[PDB]
C-alpha cells in the first residue's frame, strides 16, 4: 500500500499494491484534466476522491459499480450513507431484507461485506449536479473498470442506459451481470432479485458465495 | 425478468453439469448447447464446450478392497451384487447401460412398479438393475430418503425381482476375511448368480464392493448357444470340466476376445464363472475370431444382442412370433389375425416395411443399413427383384457376408411385409 | 397546396408524431404533423371479440392464410398444406398493445402508415386544406392522411440547402485532444435556396501576435469581436476561439437540408461541441418543427459486427440525434458500406474519383501547361476536373508526381493548369486530383501568417472535397429512389440492411396477392451446402476466352422453380439405398416434370442419404411474383433511360434502376437468413441446386465444342437436365459463320452465374463475331425458357492459378483488334491488399510477356520455363547482392487489424519490450503497413539490420546512419508458387526453389 504526491491537492490516494501496475499511469491522466474538474466544487472533497484504493483486490469476489457518487454529502465510499436517508442505500437495504429475511436495519454498510467492493464508474461529481465531471473521468473510468474486471469474476452494474453498451467499453472478456438501478434505471423502479445468481456463479468458480448479512450494523 | 430468472438462471444446468452419474444420451448431448445459451436463450455471458457419452456413476462408490487388512466397523446394509447387463431408472428415465448408453426399456409392469416406487419416495437417484439370461433382477437402489431395505420392501410391495438384505448395525471391529464372504453366500443361496456382496453405511452415497478371483487355467472347448425360439438365452461358454460360463450377450462374448480350442482361460469364480475381459496382448483380429464364432454358433447366425434367430423358419411363422400373435401360415388368415389384435394392427401402420422386416429377421440397425447403402437394386411394384453389391471392401467382417448370403430371406420378408401393408391399408 | 417530400422523421417526446418536410414550387418549406399509430392485423372473430374497443378499425377485405412451416417426411404419404379463408381487419392503436394471435407483426409501423394511406414516401402531391390544423407559421397538422394526400402531380424541380464544413485543430507529439489542443481553423461552404454558394474560413486570432493580426487585417482579412460582426461574404475571417465556436454553434443549428461531412460525427462535430461545452458551457440545441421538443447534440454509436460467414465484421457508425429534420450525412461511412476500396481515406478516394487526361503544352523548366479540353478525354470528365480544380492547389500528375498549382484558368469544356513538374516524354497524362500534402506538425512548429493562410486553404479544400464527392456519387437522387422503393424515410435509406429494406415491397405485394404467410415452429441451426464452383480445367490458357453471362440467374431460377414457402409440397428423406430407390421411383411416378419439379438437395441430418424437395411450379408465389415485378421494373427503367434527353431525368432513371437492381439482388441471401421475413431453408437449397444444375448443363454443352465447315458441333447432346420438353438433341446445327472458320472452343471457368469459354483463335474482332453467333444460337437452341444469356466480353490470355484466381485482358462487344488497355484480375496478387507493389508490378509484367510468349506457339513449356528461370535467377541475385539503396521495397499492407493495437494476433510482451526502454515513445496506432524482419547475420542465413533502428513497425524518422540490408519475406516463394501454377512444368520448378537457396531460418526473435 504505497502513495504518490501528485501535482495537485488530493490526499487520500493511498493505493494498494494491486493497483501498482496502473496507478502511475492513472497519475498521467490526472495530469491532463485535473484543473477542468477542480475549478468547480465537487460533491466529494478533493481529500475524498481516491478513497476506494486502500481495499486490496486479492481476496475479493464480487464488484458492485455505480454510476457516480451522491450529489450531496459525498464521503468517497460508494453506497455509504451515515444517515440512511438516500434512496439508493435505503432501496438496497429493503431489497436485502426482502431477499434474506433480516429486519430492523439500524445500520447497513457495504464496506464490511466480505467479497463485495463498493465502486463508482466516475470517481467524483459536482455539488448538486450528478456526474457533471463526466468527460473528465472517461479514461480513468475505463482504466479502473479494466483493472477491476481482471481481478473479479462477476460484475454487478448499476443503471441500464448508463451501462447499456458496457460490452464495447469492456474489451476484457469477463462475465458481466446486467444490474438495474434502485431508484429508477430508466425512469421506472425495479426490484431485480438476482443475488442468488451471484451466489451460484461464485459456487461455479470454486469459491464461497456471498453472505449478504455481514453488512448490518447494530 | 428476475421473478423467475429462467428458473434461477437454469439451476438445472448446474445439476446436469454435476450429473455425471445420470449420463442420459440426449441430455448430455445437447448439454453442449445448455452452457452456450448466455447469448441465445439466457442473458449475460455464458460459454463452454464439453461432451460426454459414457456413465460416471463411480462417484457413488469408494475405493476397492482386496488386500487382507482390518476395516472399520459401522452400520451395514448387506445386499447381493449380481453380474450382467446393468440399467438405471429415474422417474421415467430411459434405461441406459454403463459405458454404451444402450436403450433397452424395461417392461410396462416393471415401469409402473418403478415409477410408483419413486413416487413413494423421490430420494432414489437411480435403480441399478442386472439383466442376465434376459431376466430383470434388481441389484441396488442408492437413495437418502429411505434405507435400501425400505426401498427393496416397497418395490416388493409393488412387485419386482428384489434381492436380499442383512442388518449389520453393530458388529464390533471384526475381520472381513473369506469366512464372512462364505457366510454371506450361505445366507442367500446362489439362484441368480451373484458377483459379490456389498455393504452400505447408513445409506451412504458411496458404496463398497468386495470380491476375489478363482479363475482356472484348464481349457476352452467351444462356445455353444441355447436357441429354443423364445429369444431368451445366452451364448454360454462350456469348459472341459462339464460346466457352463455365464455371459451377458453376444456383445460381451465378442468383447471377451478369446481363442477357441486352446488353453485360454476366463475369469472363473469359486461358485460361478465371470466372462473374460480382453486385457491381454494376444493376436486376435476381428476376422478369424468372428469367422470361428459364426462357424460354432451357426452359419446364418450373426453377432447382435443374444438372439441370433434362424433363417429357414422365416416363412410366416416368424412374422407371427415377432408380432406376438397367434401362429398362422396363410396370407389372409394372417391378415385377419393382425386385424383382430388392435394394438398390433395400430403398431403396423406406425412402422415401415424395411424396419418391420429388419425386426422380423432380427437384424441390427448398425450394419444392415451400411450393407444396403452399397447395394444396387432392380425393384418393381415396391418389391425387390434383383440385388447386387458394388463395394466388396466392406465385406471384411463375416457378419455382412452372411447377411448378404441370406439376403434372399430378407427379400422374401420384405415382399411379405409389403403385401401385408398393401392389403391392410388400402 | 402543392408540395414535394424532402424527409420524414419522428419526435422522441411523450406524444409521438410523424413529421413531413416538404418544399413548394416557390421554395417555401412546409412542415406537416401526423399521428404516430401502431398497426395490427386481426381476423373477423378476433376483431369481434375484443373487450377494449380499438381506437380506429379499418377493414382489409378478404384474404387467405397459409402456413409455411417445414415438415420432414420419410415416405411419400405427406399431408397437404394448411390454408384458411377469413375476412381481415386492420387496427390502429395510439399506444403499444399486446394482442395474442396477432399476425403481420414483422412490418414496421412507418411502412404501415405509408401503405395503408397510399402515400409515396417522396412523392410530389397536391394536398387539401379541409384537414389543415395550423400549429404555427410553416407548421400544420393533418388528422386524416387519406383524403389530404388524395391527388398526385408530376415531379417538379425544387431548391435545396447544403452545408459542407471542415475543421483543423492544434497538433503535437500526441494526438490532438480537446482538453489541451485548441481549434485553429474552420472552413465552411454554404448553399442556400437562392443558389448562392459561399466559401469562408475562420482563423483563430489568438494564436498569433498582434502585429501579425494587424498585417492580416491590412492584407484584407476581417477581424471581429462578436457574432454580430461576422460576414459570410469574406473568405478569410479572423476571430477568437469563443467567437469561432459560437459561429459554429449558430451554423450547426440552422435548418439546412443536408449537413455533409467526412468522418465528421466522430471527430468534427464531437470536437466542436466538446470545445463549446468546455470553454463557454453552452450546448448545441435543435428544436422540433412545431417548437415542442428541444434536444442537445448527441453523438450515439450503432454497432453491427456480424456477417454470418467467413469474412470479418463491420465497424461502429456514429450518428447525430437531432429532431430538426436536417440530415447529418457522413461520407466516410456511406463510402465504406457502399463502395469497395483498398484505402478508405479522403485523399485516396479523391485521387481515385477525380481524374482526367490532360495534354502537355509547355516544357519551360518546371512550368508545364496541362490543357484538359474535351478532345483529350470523354464527355463530362473535363468539366468535373475543372470544377474540382477551381478550389484546389495540389495535383497528382501521372500516378505519383505530386505538384503544386502555380496558376489556373477555366475555359469552355476544359481547364488550363501549370505545375512544377519535370519534363515528361509523353504528351497525354492522367491527372488525378487529390488532397493537399503538407507537413502539419512542422507547420505548427513555426506557426505564422503564411502557414495560417496555407492551413486555411487546406481546410477550405477539405470542406469542398465533401461537396465534390457528394455531386460525383449522385447521393441525393439515390436517396430519393431508395425512399421511394424501400418504403422508408429519406434519412433511413442508408441506415439499415437488406432485411429491413425488404419489408416494404413484400407488404405491398401481399395485399395484391390476397395472401398471408404464417410461421410458428422454431428454427434450428444446420447447413445447406450446394453450388458448382467449377475449377479450371488446365492451368494455362493464352487463347481468347469469350464470356457468357446469365441474365439475373438466381431470380430466374426462383421464378422457374417456383421456390416460394407456400408452393413447396414437401421434402422426402431417406437413409438406406433400398428405401431411397423406393422413394426415387415413387417420386418419379408421382410428381412428373411436366407438372412438378423434384430438386435433389443435400440432406440436413447426417443419417439421411437422400433429400428430395418437391415444388409445384404451376401456381404463382410471393417470392416469384416479387422477383418478376422487380425485373420488369428494372427493364422498364432501363428502356426509359436511353430514351430521354434531359440530364436530370437520366440521373433519376439511373438511380431508380440502381435501387431496383439492389433490391432484386438480395432475395437469395434473404431466404438463407434465419432472422428474415422470407426464411425458407428448402426453397434456398432448391434455388442453389437448380442454379448449379443449370451451370453444369451449360458447362457440359460447351466443354469441347467445335466449328467445322460453318457447322456448330456441341460437345454433348442437347439433353434437358431435369425436365422433359419437346426439343431436339442434335448437337450439330447450322450457323451463319463463314465456312473457312475452323475452331475448337471449350468451356474452362464459371462459378455461379457466368461461363468463360476459351477459343483457340487469337483474333479479336473474329472472336467477337464468333461469340455473338454462339450467344444467339445458345439463346435459340442450347438454353430454354427465361434462362437467357448475353455475350459479355472476350478475355484474352485468361490464365489461372487456383479457384477464383485468374488474370486476363478484357475486351468489349465493339472492341477491335487495337483495343484500349484493359486488364481483369480476380483473386490474384494484383488485386489482393496484402501484396507488395513490387510483387504486383512483377506479376503484371510477367503475365504481359506471357500473353505473347505463349501465343508464339512454337515456344513450348520448356523454353518458357527456361526463360522464366533465367529472369528470376538474374533478378533475385541482383536484388540479393547489389541491393536497393532507398526504402519502399515491399511495404506489406494490411487492413485495420495490424499496427494499430500491436498487430494481428498481438505478440503481447514484444510491444511492451519497446516500452520501458524508449520512454519518449508516443501512443501508436494507424492503418499503414506491416512487416517482420530477422536481425540475424551470415547473408546465407538472412543477414538483415536490427529491429530497433528502422526496420521496426512502420513509422517515420528524421535521420539515420548505418544499415545492413532490407527485409526479405515469403514473397519470393509466393511468386515462385504463382509461376509454378502458371507454368505446366510445375513439380520440377517446385524443386528449383529449394535448389536455388533452400534456406528457411528462424523468424521473429529480437
From TrEMBL, chain A:
Residues annotated as catalytic: 68
MF terms in GO: DNA binding; hydrolase activity, hydrolyzing N-glycosyl compounds
Keyword Hydrolase on entry: yes
Keywords, comma-separated and alphabetical: DNA damage, DNA repair, DNA-binding, Glycosidase, Hydrolase
GO BP, sorted A to Z: DNA repair
Quaternary assembly: Homodimer. Interacts with protein OPG148. Component of the Uracil-DNA glycosylase(UDG)-OPG148-polymerase complex; OPG148 and UDG form a heterodimeric processivity factor that associates with OPG71 to form the processive polymerase holoenzyme.
Biological role stated in the UniProt entry: Plays an essential role in viral replication as a component of the DNA polymerase processivity factor. Excises uracil residues from the DNA which can arise as a result of misincorporation of dUMP residues by DNA polymerase or due to deamination of cytosine.
Similarity field: Belongs to the uracil-DNA glycosylase (UDG) superfamily. UNG family.
Protein name (record): Uracil-DNA glycosylase
Organism: Monkeypox virus
Gene designation: E4R
UniProtKB/TrEMBL annotation, chain B:
Top-rank lineage group of the source organism: Viruses
Keyword entries, A-Z: DNA replication
Matching Pfam families: Chordopox_A20R
Gene Ontology annotations of biological process type: DNA replication
Protein name: DNA polymerase processivity factor
Taxonomic source organism: Monkeypox virus (MPXV)
Protein's gene: A22R
TrEMBL record, chain C:
Transmembrane segments: none
Residues annotated for dCTP binding in this entry: 552-554
Protein name: DNA polymerase
Gene3D superfamilies according to UniProt: Helix hairpin bin, Palm domain of DNA polymerase, Ribonuclease H-like superfamily/Ribonuclease H
Annotated ranges, domain DNA-directed DNA polymerase family B exonuclease: 110-349
Residues reported in the UniProt entry to bind Ca(2+) 2: 549-550, 753
Entry similarity comment: Belongs to the DNA polymerase type-B family.
Organism whose genome encodes this protein: Monkeypox virus
